[PDB]
Amino acid sequence: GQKVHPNGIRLGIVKPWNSTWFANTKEFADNLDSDFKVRQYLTKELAKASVSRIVIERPAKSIRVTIHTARPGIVIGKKGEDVEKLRKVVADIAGVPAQINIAEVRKPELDAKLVADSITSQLERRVMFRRAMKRAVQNAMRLGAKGIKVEVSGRLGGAEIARTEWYREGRVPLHTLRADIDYNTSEAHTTYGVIGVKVWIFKGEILGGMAAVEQPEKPAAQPKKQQRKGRK
Template identity: 30%
Template sequence: MGQKINSLGFRLGKIKKHKSIWYSKFNKYQTILKEDIFIRQYLENLKLNFLNILILREEINNKILIVIEVSNLKSLDLDIKTIINNIKKKLKISEKILIKFNEIKNIFKNSRAITYLIITQLQKRISYKKIINNILSKIKKEKIGGIKISIAGRINGAELARYEWFKKGRIPLQTLRADIDFNFSKLYTSYGILGIKVWIFKKELY
């Protein structure tokens, strides 16, 4: 079962929290859900490699708070006012929108940061084995239980698609108390799509 289900979805409500936190009446649920999907897609289309996007809604204060996790806060060059105005225009909403940034200092404990690192280096035509070996050597110093990285597709432009995976330590996917950070990303290349998955086993809770 641990191999056939999303590791985050499997743990939602137990040790993992939802990425959108709000409450609404049944007739409003569909429109609010569509708004959340649009906000996420709009921010991801900026291609600034945001690690996580959390949306909090306060109906009483008529406010939407968007918390964005980034790896390097200093490198961001954003006009937040135009971003907020564009979201408001597209969604035609009157709610007050606030955007807050949180910097993650240790990217080697974040699965999304590692997938971005792999994607940027693959785009520079660096060998996938060299990339993953560098990541595994750097992750030795971190206090984590284990890591697994998989790449699927026409790797290095090969004629046949294949599946390669690398593992270090434990990845107990069936254990609900295991704090596992998972991310899946796609890399669009001239010879096809590569699927990159990263599992990080941080620690056992309880």
């Protein structure tokens, strides 16, 4: 049947959002949207690229854009001139100042978005292809992670109908909430149709960017302090 995005469930318990700004109802939405406009307006400059992914913040009274590259020398450019052009492209679109951001991707075939995409680019494209997926899986295993699945669809092999193939190595739990992970799903166009790719990577039992709860309050809290009791 159908499944949840691993991740999306997760957000706020194990995984950060994605964008990170405040907003709300009178400005929420919008924002959301600017985002949507950044994404489409910046990402066509990025895509040419080794950027996997972007995250938007927002600080502040600006916009933002953190970019994950992968690579970063290809988006920074000669003496930083680009990152200045990137951003000027932010911004633009957006109504505020914006800033770029850097990020580094990572072990690039670890990811997923960048691994995927690497196989979506080969299928666009197309080349003998197949483979790729095998690989990627090998890779990722490899660079890091405890398992990876890949799946490729749309249709495959040029076709009249639909289709789909997959590979996977290590591992990959599904219901485990938890942790973390990762994930992913990206598409795409070719002269026969849309082509689609999924990737799922299990990192093991490791903690995410957050988590969920904060550390214990009771150490802390302690009863020995003076207060109070409001109220004054």
